[PDB]
Amino acid sequence: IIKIRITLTSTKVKQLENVSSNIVKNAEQHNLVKKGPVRLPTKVLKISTRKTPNGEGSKTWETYEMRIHKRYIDLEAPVQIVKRITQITIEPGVDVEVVV
Amino acid sequence: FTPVVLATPIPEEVQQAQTEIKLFNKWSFEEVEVKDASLVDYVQVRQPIFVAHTAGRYANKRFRKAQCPIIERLTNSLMMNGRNNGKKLKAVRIIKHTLDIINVLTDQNPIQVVVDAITNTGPREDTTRVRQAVDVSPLRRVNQAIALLTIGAREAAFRNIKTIAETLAEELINAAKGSSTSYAIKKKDELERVAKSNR
Amino acid sequence: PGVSVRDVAAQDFINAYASFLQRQGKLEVPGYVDIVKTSSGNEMPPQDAEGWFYKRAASVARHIYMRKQVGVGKLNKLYGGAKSRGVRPYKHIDASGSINRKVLQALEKIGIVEISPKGGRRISENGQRDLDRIAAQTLEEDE
């Protein structure tokens, strides 16, 4: 069996947590050893801009936010479990990177 | 008294804090009493403090300022002139130096000297725009006395050889003795001079 | 009774190690003294030309003792202050790199610091010995 690490990145917190719980459940159902899902903190990609498309009026600024939450979950599993765990989490919105 | 030691040695000049009657590390707080009866409950001594740097909330309510140590109120009012906004460490060092200089010149318990200066320089009657002669509340009396003392020390120390600490010391000494050479006493005398001419 | 550099904090140890480096006679001075400002963000050279390099060396040695390996850039950032840019707002400016690098090389030649496997200079065994001796001497001479 191989050492693997699954890195999950998303703006959708519900989808991210659903995928992380799916991975944890699929690990515990086969009784594998895993270092629990570590939550890499939300990168708030703040962007401040001017509301007006011109230069008139009260100088009102406007901040937009893009919250990038990250999870990482590393465990040990054979090639069959590795392939089925990378092919069980295709939830729309979560980026999944599996490294050996 | 009780010269016990521990692994990190902290000196007996610190260990003598509370074995006897409580005090600040140089000036006692029990031998301080305001020379009047109206400025009680608005000049705050006893409780005592080891340093006039209580980073405490005192402005979210109306009369909570009266519970702030009067030495710290003097420090906060020294914490002014714009260039010196902030610099509370500077202001508390100035207060320490001022207290030492007060004790050097006619020692008289420099905390007690500060209290006497405030009580003497609190204007009792002032004028309001309607002018009309009105009385002054004790809280405003304390606030105006502190403001006058600090401002006098500030503009005395401005552009002259003596430091802010010693200018404040002279101002507090003269105000406590009630002499007309202190700026705060002169200003309070002017405010009370136009109190009777506007009745 | 088990006294380290962390028992005298900021000025007594620094002045005593500067005095020790002065009396040891080993100067390691680059000849830049009297000429340099120690930072582009300064306005004047050090006031005491004889001994400012020794205080710098003592400070660098203590700074490398108190933590792990420290480099020339870290020392530059540490010793650089704000610069009066005229009618422009102040800003942090890094200190002189050559002075810090030559201080590091001087303490290397004396054997107080050594090159780290991970970069920068880490205090040497003899460096700790000398610094601990100075700390104990300062403590036993003046509380």
């Binding site: - | - | 009297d34 000429i35 400002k37 306005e43 004047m44 050279p45």
Partner: protein, 145 residues
């Protein structure tokens, strides 16, 4: 600190390189009054002269003053770097000078004069009296009097 009796042996404002130098100021800042030497240059020359900088300009000696003058007039010779000089590779001989006299004004006038003689834009701006370093003239430096 010591005996400073010196009943008749203190120099009040004195003469140095055709410039009045106050004897009541510490040596370096007293010397900074000469046109061509500033704080850093005076500090460097006073440390090269082996003079005690902690004393006023009026009591040091009558000969180490001339030593400072010699060091000041010959900086590159007394172990002073070229980058410490106000006149490097000046315009016509490449030597490193330090104009320290009532001659820094002369050299400045020579530079301005050569610029306007060759009709360079800086020289023309100097002739008009306007700002020369690309500054905005719309709002600042109006009265100047």
């Amino acid at each position: 600190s010591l005996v400073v009796q010196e009943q008749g042996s203190f120099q009040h404002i004195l003469r140095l390189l055709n410039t009045n130098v106050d004897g009541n100021i510490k040596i370096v800042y007293a010397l900074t009054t000469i046109k061509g030497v500033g704080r850093r240059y005076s500090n460097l020359v006073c440390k090269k002269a082996d003079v005690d900088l902690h004393k006023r300009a009026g009591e040091l000696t009558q000969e180490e003053l001339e030593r400072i003058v010699q060091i000041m007039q010959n900086p590159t010779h007394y172990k002073i770097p070229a980058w410490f000089l106000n006149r490097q590779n000046d315009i016509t001989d490449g030597k490193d000078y330090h104009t320290l006299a009532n001659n820094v004004e002369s050299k400045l006038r020579d530079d301005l004069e050569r610029l306007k003689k060759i009709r360079a834009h800086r020289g023309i701006r100097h002739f008009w009296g306007l700002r020369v370093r690309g500054q905005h003239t719309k709002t600042t430096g109006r009265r100047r009097a």
